[PDB]
Design a protein around this ligand. Structure first.
Ligand SMILES: *[C@@H]1O[C@H](CO)[C@@H](O[C@@H]2O[C@H](CO)[C@@H](O[C@@H]3O[C@H](CO[C@H]4O[C@H](CO)[C@@H](O)[C@H](O)[C@@H]4O)[C@@H](O)[C@H](O[C@H]4O[C@H](CO)[C@@H](O)[C@H](O)[C@@H]4O)[C@@H]3O)[C@H](O)[C@H]2NC(C)=O)[C@H](O)[C@H]1NC(C)=O
Ligand SMILES: *[C@@H]1O[C@H](CO)[C@@H](O[C@@H]2O[C@H](CO)[C@@H](O[C@@H]3O[C@H](CO[C@H]4O[C@H](CO)[C@@H](O)[C@H](O)[C@@H]4O)[C@@H](O)[C@H](O[C@H]4O[C@H](CO)[C@@H](O)[C@H](O)[C@@H]4O)[C@@H]3O)[C@H](O)[C@H]2NC(C)=O)[C@H](O)[C@H]1NC(C)=O
Ligand SMILES: *[C@@H]1O[C@H](CO)[C@@H](O[C@@H]2O[C@H](CO)[C@@H](O[C@H]3O[C@H](CO[C@H]4O[C@H](CO)[C@@H](O)[C@H](O)[C@@H]4O)[C@@H](O)[C@H](O[C@H]4O[C@H](CO)[C@@H](O)[C@H](O)[C@@H]4O)[C@@H]3O)[C@H](O)[C@H]2NC(C)=O)[C@H](O)[C@H]1NC(C)=O
Ligand SMILES: *[C@@H]1O[C@H](CO)[C@@H](O[C@@H]2O[C@H](CO)[C@@H](O[C@@H]3O[C@H](CO)[C@@H](O)[C@H](O)[C@@H]3O)[C@H](O)[C@H]2NC(C)=O)[C@H](O)[C@H]1NC(C)=O
Ligand SMILES: *[C@@H]1O[C@H](CO)[C@@H](O[C@@H]2O[C@H](CO)[C@@H](O[C@@H]3O[C@H](CO)[C@@H](O)[C@H](O)[C@@H]3O)[C@H](O)[C@H]2NC(C)=O)[C@H](O)[C@H]1NC(C)=O
Ligand SMILES: *[C@@H]1O[C@H](CO)[C@@H](O[C@@H]2O[C@H](CO)[C@@H](O)[C@H](O)[C@H]2NC(C)=O)[C@H](O)[C@H]1NC(C)=O
Ligand SMILES: *[C@@H]1O[C@H](CO)[C@@H](O)[C@H](O)[C@H]1NC(C)=O
Ligand SMILES: *[C@@H]1O[C@H](CO)[C@@H](O)[C@H](O)[C@H]1NC(C)=O
Ligand SMILES: *[C@@H]1O[C@H](CO)[C@@H](O)[C@H](O)[C@H]1NC(C)=O
Ligand SMILES: *[C@@H]1O[C@H](CO)[C@@H](O)[C@H](O)[C@H]1NC(C)=O
Lengths: 171, 217, 548, 544, 217
């Protein structure tokens, strides 16, 4: 089946931001055309990479792709927010040992200072400037509802929380 | 209940031409003749031209001629001059002691010569703290009232941000005074340098321009 | 032989109104009196007539709302009842020869407003020409005042010219196209010794208040003197980048025409005591030079406070500003939303709320500022001020009138802030506090007399055990409630048990207590009874009756 | 009839050398020639003799290293080989009547030095006594020149004294212990009109070159030489903290005895072009004042280069320097440094100050916290403490006890923090106020009884018109100070005129006033006299 | 291999006194009388007083008397003057053409005790530009020669950074003159304030101190 790839990987963007949904699988059948599914409706783009320029609120929702194969791809979800701080994250479900990058991102390349991450309420890490937490592994206790407090243009902003949960990759 | 229809509501005729203003009444006036014709300008009480529908009032010129009887009455104004820039009214008196005015009728016109004294006033520093800048152009002791004021902000002709005030005719030298206020924001005021008022008038052979630049005076 | 009208003003709907036609030259036992009205932008409309015998007749639309009466031999009154907005008009009285209104003698008319836009006071600004465009011998000069932004009519401008003659000329008003308010230009032409003469315009606006007078004083030049320039220098921090233990600020007022000159230092706008700074004036030739030195602690400098050098020279103010330097200055927009004060709610009975938005970066475009109510019921029109500040930001203030009954029953009002450069919309909301109620206790005190404080005394007031926290404190003296700036009042803090307290401190002078030594501390508070105010008087004399 | 020696100079060990004795007046076909040497500080030592026939006879220690030859009718050469440092000597030639060296006609001698150091020219410095230590008359005066750092010997100093005479005295040379070079002092004692007379020493060093001549020309007094104070002032950034297009620096040389000056500006130690700055001078009474204005681009200022004001007054250099300032939060960290509380300072007499640093990262590598005084006097140990916060930051707090008297006389105390991740050290400084002093007024009131509140009262204390703002407030009941939680006191705010005020509020119970109804409001403030403490008691009684 | 012993190496006698200098030879001189007596001052060649062990040289005064024969020889200087303060030598000529000088004898004129005049010299500003500071203490016109100079830099006694120069005994008043130079770096000079020279001499009842503070001049 053709799996669906995101460039950048982050399924949570800001309003006004770009992203390009690419969709590819094994080349058992040759790549000629692709079908796109915003919410279930067929999109008018045929070529394998769909660009998604300048996000609106209606750009939210379930996304899916298809090729000339028989069954379809998975329901990737795209939430779009307008706010001050979005704690972006790599994947919403991960399997142990895979890379995880976290990023408390601020509106239109703006710099967030005094950045503090919270995992389940407690302070996971604090850094003076913005920081990329990168955990190359993913324990089963890493599962938590995360959120980040930051300081953008001297004022304090808390991001909306996001729950993430790892499972065991055997079975 | 009873009506007076003054027709037309607007009429235009040049110098040497004439206008006719008709008043038609639903019921005949008292003694078939009791109607007046009034002349009114801006900010003034109306001035009596005709009383008793044909008889000229004292001080009115002979070029105002009233006529008519019963229900149908007509003011004819021949040999036009600029003191006829007015709204004209008719007044009927009736049985039952009833006075009703007419609807009104407007004419435009010009005549003699006397040149304007132009002055320009920059906005004050107390006004610039409030976020507004008003630039004042004064046209002083002039005649004709027909004069044109143009605003130039860095040689660009303004439109829609200026308002004029025209005075009454003076009781001594029979002249007019005008001011045009150009209203800008403080941010629009401080982005520009040259502020010019151009005055076109018939006693002026060329349009005179009074200007300043911002902050140098 | 003329007629004049008087009594036209701004009143509310439903108010009775009496106009007066005063005649001169003729007799009312020979001539009749007609009344005619005219709204702005329509034609004339006959109202009525009174004859010599006193009989009045009125038009068909009048319906008994109008009455004419002969009050004296020269005055004729017109009484008017059941006013709505359709009667907003200019009213003429006329000398009638007969029952027809065909006449050549009319009064100039008086103006009656029944309106629904805001009663706004005029802003008065001087109109002087540029002085380089004014000639040396210019034996007369024309100057003026612009009185703009008022609603409704009229304003009355008179002139004080001093010892000169001045011909005064007031133009007809122009309706401003954006706001609907009015604007007048009143011009004064004087002759003679105008270059050193002080000129004064008096603008009265009787729809605001009967004694609303703006008394603007100015001269006819904007050169005046050669203009000084102000600059502030500072000490360097050292070679390791570290601040010295004290900071010197040197305010330099460069070459100006010699005169009295007057320097105030400000820390975030508040005047510091003159003992903490020096000043020096030198003269070289025909030109003066002034320096002022201010000494500051390193701590105060590092606390990012803003300091202003204020120069007052010949009645003109110059200024310069400084704050702690920075390589980069990030800042973001913030917003605050107040509740109405109890004084405005219950004494003035005209409550408002203010959304104050500060520290925005002055980018391109106006900031979207919208008021709304959670109930969906309509909001009133608000007022909006935008002001550039000394520290370089722009502060926008929006003031919304609120209904008194609306506020008391627990309505929630929202201030909504939008701007294209904002990430998201900013939201503030306000509503009456849902906590309990408790009445204030009030205690007023005077400090004793001791050396060095003979002609100035300090009074104090304690207000305590009240709930909720919103309260207004004023001081009243000799049938005037004294201005807020005269005294100081602390912020509400929690008492140990139940409720809040505030203290107020008022320094008074000898002439005030010799005028009246009774001073009243007054608190306005929602839980106070029976009329939401509580007050206590104190006399400072407090006589020493030892052992009673 | 005389003899003279030539050829003595500085050579290395092992270098052959030839001296020439030139004779005049007599014949070498009649008289013999003796050679005698003398090391410095040692007696005379005979080397050899040549007769009229050319036969040469030497001493026992010579061992063939010395050779004497008749070169002309007036010159006799002496050749030395195998020279070591023991041959450093003044060498004399003598007209011998016989093979005995008993003679009355000797040459002046030539100096032979055996060393391995570099030929260095002397540096000549004036030696004047201090003019406040010179008396007003001082009918003779002694001055001199120091000719130092030269190698080898000799220098010669003569003197130009003008219309004065002056006795001249030259001391023997001293070998410098570190370099091996020589140094001499030549002194001149003059009498008369020495205060206006211009004096010159002439130092010549013939081992450098034959016409190496240094005049040092100087007077008895340097031209007063009040050391002129240098200070650098600078342009403002504006009210938003933004820099202007250019930066002005103003170097001030304020209040000094007038004389010749310059001001030179350096950008990272290199001299900037003369047209880039303008200097001006004024005089007031006796004291002069000088200023110099330098214009810099914004870019240069922001490049963090060091700009130096170099003031040269009467030939001596006075300095000040600047670079772009350091804006107190390099990585978003904050640091705060308190003053002592007046209660701690004046009542307990154990004042402390506290340095608190917040929003540090919890990484490894301990912070270096150091305390100091601007005077360099010692400080005690402090209570260094770190703790991680619930929000993930790390705060370090330190409390230092300070001397009471030390604080009162205006010492400045400095807290210094270094972390490995910080790019530079962070400093905070605190000191006593520089404003005036005004003692507080204290007024204390008891509320009257309010209906329904029989068992409670409120006490209010107004403390006002004090300067500076630092103050402590305590409440006492039954001679013991009540806990701070019992009462509420506001923060200092300015009065309408001079000074500050606070209010204090204390709720009390019936049990307390029935136990003792007298309660004391006491303020501790640095301007209060005699023991920095003023109080006022209050009761809930009537006159009765 | 042969010796000439001149005894004593030093002798003191006042003005008008007499000294005796003996030279003893290990082998008899050539013809039993070939010995000379020389007088030498500093910077000068020696001057012949006696040749042939008793015969006075031309220009030498009659108060110099040589005597002796064989191996034992004696110079007697009666009627001593302050000019005679010098170093005196004997020269023996031997068989095999060998001339041997004596070891030398310093004759000191015993004169009165003079206290030194102390002066202090701060380093010049042009020396301070080179990175070195030398502070000079001068002791002027003293007898006898023994004195002690101590340097105090902010009341700390210096050691190892000062050097002294002593003149010869003067030919007129028979006094001595001394200088002590304290050598510091410029950084060590500018770290301190008070610079004191303390002088102890036997004509001084107390050690006299001349000091200065840095600059103040
Ligand atoms: C998604 O990602 C891209 C980054 O790759 C973001 O921006 C793209 O930016 C380029 C450069 O601006 C766009 O290319 C073209 O831009 C022109 C204007 O900029 C150029 O020209 C001016 C002088 O005219 C120069 O000063 C400047 O430096 C640039 O060189 C437009 O004129 C082009 O034509 C069309 O564009 C506009 C768009 O509003 C239309 O309205 C016009 O009618 C015209 O037909 C051209 O667009 C490039 O297009 C941008 N990409 C996209 C997708 O728009 C995007 O902003 C980013 N999108 C997000 C985050 O939503
Ligand atoms: C993570 O969590 C920690 C706490 O766990 C936070 O640290 C706090 O940071 C704030 C901000 O700096 C601290 O507030 C400061 O407290 C100082 C302490 O002063 C004491 O002494 C004075 C005088 O006696 C008293 O008035 C005061 O109440 C204290 O008892 C104040 O001096 C500071 O004042 C500063 O701001 C004011 C304006 O409010 C200025 O006028 C001053 O000049 C001065 O600049 C300030 O109030 C707070 O104390 C810290 N907490 C602790 C427990 O120490 C971290 O900030 C947080 N991390 C993030 C990213 O937020
Ligand atoms: C594909 O499916 C998607 C989901 O099934 C559909 O997405 C949905 O679209 C609507 C409208 O586009 C989203 O509603 C958003 O807009 C309105 C109005 O915006 C105003 O309020 C915002 C408050 O966040 C402000 O930020 C704005 O500046 C503006 O003033 C709001 O009512 C919504 O806010 C609510 O929801 C968000 C989360 O989305 C919360 O954060 C808010 O607090 C509030 O509760 C939205 O902003 C709607 O949210 C969105 N659904 C999801 C799950 O995101 C999509 O339309 C569809 N596509 C097509 C083509 O049919
Ligand atoms: C989907 O993505 C593919 C990526 O290869 C696009 O294919 C090719 O895209 C280019 C650019 O649009 C087309 O060619 C261009 O023609 C112009 C004519 O002026 C010329 O200037 C260019 O150099 C280039 O040759 C090309 O036709 C197209 N190929 C095919 C087979 O379509 C494709 O266009 C994308 N589809 C979209 C965006 O709908
Ligand atoms: C897309 O999804 C469908 C889901 O059903 C895939 O279907 C596959 O169908 C075959 C045919 O039945 C299944 O194989 C065998 O079926 C027989 C008879 O029913 C049964 O007895 C066997 O036990 C076996 O199940 C097959 O299991 C089923 N699933 C998968 C995962 O292959 C279809 O193949 C999918 N398409 C692609 C391209 O993956
Ligand atoms: C923890 O993470 C490491 C790093 O991802 C895992 O080790 C493998 O490391 C190599 C390094 O080149 C990667 O290419 C592999 O993809 C990694 N394997 C996996 C399964 O991620 C390691 O397995 C992880 N361990 C646990 C317990 O999660
Ligand atoms: C303005 O001037 C007139 C002139 O006497 C005076 O009556 C009036 O009170 C003045 N207005 C004010 C506000 O002082
Ligand atoms: C303050 O400024 C005004 C303006 O010239 C001046 O009249 C007044 O005397 C000044 N006062 C002092 C104390 O300088
Ligand atoms: C230096 O001074 C001496 C002393 O008068 C003089 O003779 C000599 O010529 C001078 N030399 C120079 C180069 O000035
Ligand atoms: C003084 O300083 C200026 C600036 O470098 C220099 O050009 C000038 O030559 C100096 N003059 C003297 C006499 O040192």
């Amino acid at each position: 089946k053709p799996k669906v790839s995101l460039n950048p990987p982050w399924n949570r963007i800001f309003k006004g931001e770009n992203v390009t949904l690419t969709c590819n699988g094994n080349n058992f059948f040759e790549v000629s055309s692709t079908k796109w599914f915003h919410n279930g409706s067929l999109s008018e783009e045929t070529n394998s990479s769909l660009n998604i320029v300048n996000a609106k609120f209606e750009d939210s929702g379930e996304y899916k792709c298809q090729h000339q194969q028989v069954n379809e791809s998975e329901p990737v979800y795209l939430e779009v927010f307008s706010d001050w701080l979005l704690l972006q994250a790599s994947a919403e479900v991960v399997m142990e040992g895979q890379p995880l990058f976290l990023r408390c991102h601020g509106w239109r390349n703006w710099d967030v200072y005094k950045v503090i991450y919270y995992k389940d309420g407690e302070a996971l890490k604090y850094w003076y400037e913005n920081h990329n937490i990168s955990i190359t592994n993913a324990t089963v206790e890493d599962s938590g509802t995360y959120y980040c407090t930051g300081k953008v243009w001297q004022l304090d902003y808390e991001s909306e929380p996001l729950n993430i949960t790892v499972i065991k990759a055997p079975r | 209940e009873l009506d007076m229809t003054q027709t037309p509501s607007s009429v235009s005729a040049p110098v040497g031409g004439s206008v006719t203003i008709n008043c038609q009444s639903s019921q005949s006036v008292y003694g078939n003749n009791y109607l007046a014709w009034y002349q009114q300008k801006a900010g003034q009480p109306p001035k009596l031209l005709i009383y008793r529908a044909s008889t000229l009032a004292s001080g009115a010129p002979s070029r105002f001629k009233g006529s008519g009887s019963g229900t149908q009455f007509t003011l004819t104004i021949s040999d036009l001059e600029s003191d006829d820039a007015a709204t004209y009214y008719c007044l009927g008196y009736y049985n039952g002691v009833i006075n009703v005015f007419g609807g009104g009728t407007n004419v435009e016109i010009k005549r003699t010569v006397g040149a304007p004294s132009v002055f320009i006033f920059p906005p004050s520093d107390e006004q610039l703290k409030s976020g507004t800048a008003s630039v004042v152009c004064l046209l002083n002791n002039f005649y004709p009232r027909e004069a044109k004021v143009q605003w130039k902000v860095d040689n660009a002709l303004q439109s829609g941000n200026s308002q004029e005030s025209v005075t009454e005719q003076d009781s001594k030298d029979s002249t007019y005074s005008l001011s045009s206020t150009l209203t800008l924001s403080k941010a629009d005021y401080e982005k520009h340098k040259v502020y010019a008022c151009e005055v076109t008038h018939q006693g002026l052979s060329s349009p005179v321009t009074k200007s300043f630049n911002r902050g140098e005076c | 032989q003329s007629l004049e009208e008087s009594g036209g003003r701004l009143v509310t709907p439903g108010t009775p109104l009496t106009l007066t036609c005063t005649v001169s030259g003729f007799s009312l036992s020979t001539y009749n009196i007609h009344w005619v009205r005219q709204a702005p932008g329509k034609g004339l409309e006959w109202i009525g007539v009174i004859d010599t015998g006193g009989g009045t007749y009125f038009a068909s639309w009048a319906k008994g709302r109008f009455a004419i009466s002969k009050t004296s031999s020269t005055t004729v009154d017109l009484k008017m009842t059941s006013l709505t907005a359709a009667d907003t008009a200019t009213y003429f009285c006329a000398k009638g020869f007969d029952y027809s209104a065909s006449t050549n003698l009319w009064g100039p008319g008086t103006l009656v407003t029944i309106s629904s836009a805001s009663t706004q006071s005029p802003s008065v600004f001087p109109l002087t020409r540029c002085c380089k465009n004014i000639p040396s011998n210019a034996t007369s000069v024309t100057l003026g005042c612009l009185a703009t932004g008022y609603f409704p009519e009229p304003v009355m401008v008179t002139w004080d010219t001093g010892s000169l003659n001045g011909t005064t000329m007031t133009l007809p008003a122009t309706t401003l196209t954006l706001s609907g308010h009015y604007a007048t230009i009143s011009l004064l032409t004087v002759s003679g010794a105008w270059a050193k003469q002080m000129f004064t315009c008096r603008v009265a606006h009787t729809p605001s208040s009967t004694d609303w007078v703006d008394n603007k004083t100015f001269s006819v030049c904007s050169r005046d003197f050669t203009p000084p320039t102000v600059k502030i220098l500072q000490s360097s921090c050292d070679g390791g980048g570290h601040f010295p233990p004290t900071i010197q600020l040197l305010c330099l007022v460069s070459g100006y025409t010699p005169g009295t000159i007057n320097i105030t230092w400000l820390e975030d706008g508040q005047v510091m005591d003159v003992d903490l700074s020096t000043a020096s004036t030198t003269q070289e030739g025909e030109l003066a030079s002034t320096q002022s030195e201010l000494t500051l602690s390193q701590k105060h400098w590092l606390s990012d406070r803003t300091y202003t050098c204020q120069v007052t020279y010949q009645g003109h103010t110059f200024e310069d500003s400084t704050k702690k330097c920075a390589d980069s200055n990030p800042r973001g927009v913030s917003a605050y939303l107040s509740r109405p004060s109890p004084f405005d709610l219950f004494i003035r009975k005209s409550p408002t709320i203010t959304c104050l938005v500060v520290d925005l970066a002055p980018s391109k475009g106006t900031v979207n500022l919208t008021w709304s109510r959670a109930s969906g019921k309509p909001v009133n029109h608000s007022t909006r001020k935008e002001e550039k500040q000394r520290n370089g930001t722009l502060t926008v203030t929006s003031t919304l009138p609120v209904g008194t009954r609306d506020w008391i029953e627990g309505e929630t009002y929202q201030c909504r802030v939008t701007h294209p450069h904002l990430p998201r919309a900013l939201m503030r909301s306000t509503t009456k506090t849902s906590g309990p109620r408790a009445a204030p206790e009030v205690y007023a005190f005077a400090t004793p007399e001791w050396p060095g404080s003979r002609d100035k005394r300090t009074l104090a007031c304690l207000i305590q055990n009240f709930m909720p926290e919103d309260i207004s404190v004023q001081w009243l003296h000799n049938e005037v409630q004294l201005p807020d700036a005269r005294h100081s009042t602390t912020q509400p803090r929690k008492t140990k048990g139940s409720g809040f307290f505030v203290f107020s401190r008022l320094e008074v002078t000898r002439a005030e207590w010799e005028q009246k030594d009774e001073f009243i501390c007054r608190a306005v508070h929602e839980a106070a009874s029976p009329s939401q105010t509580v007050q206590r008087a104190v006399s400072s004399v407090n006589p020493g009756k030892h052992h009673h």
